[PDB]
Amino acid sequence: APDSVDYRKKGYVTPVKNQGQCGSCWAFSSVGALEGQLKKKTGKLLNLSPQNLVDCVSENDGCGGGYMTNAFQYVQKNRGIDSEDAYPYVGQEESCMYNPTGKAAKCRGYREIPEGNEKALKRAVARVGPVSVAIDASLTSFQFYSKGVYYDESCNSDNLNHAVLAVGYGIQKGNKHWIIKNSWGENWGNKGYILMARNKNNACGIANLASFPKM
Numbered sequence: 463a464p465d466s467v468d469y470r471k472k473g474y475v476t477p478v479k480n481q482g483q484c485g486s487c488w489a490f491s492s493v494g495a496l497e498g499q500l501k502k503k504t505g506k507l508l509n510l511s512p513q514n515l516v517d518c519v520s521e522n523d524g525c526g527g528g529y530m531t532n533a534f535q536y537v538q539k540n541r542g543i544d545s546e547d548a549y550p551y552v553g554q555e556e557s558c559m560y561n562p563t564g565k566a567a568k569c570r571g572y573r574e575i576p577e578g579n580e581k582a583l584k585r586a587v588a589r590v591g592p593v594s595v596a597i598d599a600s601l602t603s604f605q606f607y608s609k610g611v612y613y614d615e616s617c618n619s620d621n622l623n624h625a626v627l628a629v630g631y632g633i634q635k636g637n638k639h640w641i642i643k644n645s646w647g648e649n650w651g652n653k654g655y656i657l658m659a660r661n662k663n664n665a666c667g668i669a670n671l672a673s674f675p676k677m
């Protein structure tokens with residue numbers, strides 16, 4: 463009886479969002495990780511504010527990209543992150559309008575998964591919850607994905623360019639996989655999700671930049 467986990471059934475995941483014309487993949491990924499830990503610690507979750515991260519995380523580059531660890535760092539220093547409702551996503555960077563009245567979660571730090579270790583990533587997903595990850599999502603085969611377990615050998619593990627959220631893992635038709643929540647709208651892939659090959663030599667670099675927030 464193989465290990466399997468789907469945090470969507472557990473109430474750790476919010477509906478799929480859409481970055482729009484904004485390289486904010488990392489903000490949705492971070493918010494997604496924070497949301498999982500929120501549910502796990504407080505028993506309930508809310509939609510956190512990715513726009514809050516885009517505008518305030520000065521260490522990152524807004525619509526120009528950013529690292530999830532900088533996001534977590536920010537929330538800890540700032541002593542809070544706004545809810546999606548208090549700081550709505552507009553799809554482009556603007557001045558930092560963080561307001562403590564709309565706080566919906568806190569962060570006390572973060573941990574990175576040892577680079578390249580899918581086993582460690584598997585344990586983290588199982589012991590912590592949804593984990594922020596990065597991959598190479600530039601391949602056409604990746605972008606037009608619709609079902610099954612994605613695997614394309616050309617995927618370059620040394621070219622991480624898109625941040626996502628690992629909300630679980632398991633196996634389909636004999637092929638092990640990671641359950642990945644994207645931020646290109648539910649119109650993308652399978653209702654916004656995509657199953658990516660797991661234990662297939664770290665395909666797409668799925669484990670080269672994984673981390674989660676301590677809450």
Ligand SMILES: *C(=O)[C@H](CCCC)NC(=O)OC1(Cc2ccccc2)CCCC1
Pocket residue numbers: 481484485486487488525526527528529530595596597622623624625671
């Ligand atoms: C996801 O929307 C962004 C898109 C960036 C627009 C150019 N991807 C991203 O943030 O990539 C990471 C950070 C980064 C950005 C640019 C060059 C190098 C690194 C890399 C993996 C996760 C975020």
